[PDB]
Amino acid sequence: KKVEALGEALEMKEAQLAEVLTAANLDPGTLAAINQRLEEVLDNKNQIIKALQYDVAKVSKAHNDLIRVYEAKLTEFGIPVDELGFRPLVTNTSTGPAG
Amino acid sequence: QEKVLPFWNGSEVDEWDYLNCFFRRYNKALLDKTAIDKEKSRLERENADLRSILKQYLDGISVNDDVLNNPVNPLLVVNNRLQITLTERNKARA
Amino acid sequence: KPTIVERYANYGSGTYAPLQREGRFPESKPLGKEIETEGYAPVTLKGVVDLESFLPSRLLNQRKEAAVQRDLKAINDLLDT
């Protein structure tokens, strides 16, 4: 039903766009170019949002895993004082960004 | 990607819904493989089209038995076959 | 040489920090056969509906038998008696 509601929103917005363009009847070239460069701006914004969210997740996981590995090495060596606490990570496993 | 987020983008757990995150990861892999299959499926057909156009182009240059056998060929024209075919292709591609 | 369970439980809480001295580097591919599937994922609803169209079947939901049947028939007759 959420998909249905979003489809209804898409349908009404598309119909509104069609009627607005058929009413304005402005020249294609310049107005189209306006459309493409702000479409590109929006696309780059979405892409960088996605990439930087993934960057946050990746750096947080590396941070937490490296904290655990240092704690393990120190407690193996017998250093009993542990200092730093883990950050709210969602995914824990062996991976690349450790060494 | 899935090495660092294998799960997504508080009571006890029942056995039926016990593996849902693993099924999420499985479904992610399935979707990626289906995308791979779609991309390939378009690539091989475009490659076949390129092979066909290349072959008929080489035929266009050469003087070959199949070139003569094709009744629509500039190398030897009878009863305006070539001209009729050209105007038909023009009206079909118009 | 530890067991797999011991090795996974030891480092961190389910991880492994390989020392650079062993030279076992499986977590990093040689970059020759590298894998990156992010580009293939659809960015438009056209691509989304096309992927939905692809593969709907998975989207939706002897002599030994004869010998065993003979043995079960005989034992059932014996139980009847």
């Binding site: 824990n92 496993t93 | 508080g10 757990v13 016990y18 849902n20 | -």
Partner: peptide, 14 residues
Amino acid sequence: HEQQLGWDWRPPDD
């Protein structure tokens, strides 16, 4: 549990 699909893991008593 903690790696694949636990979401929570609890030791027994003894």
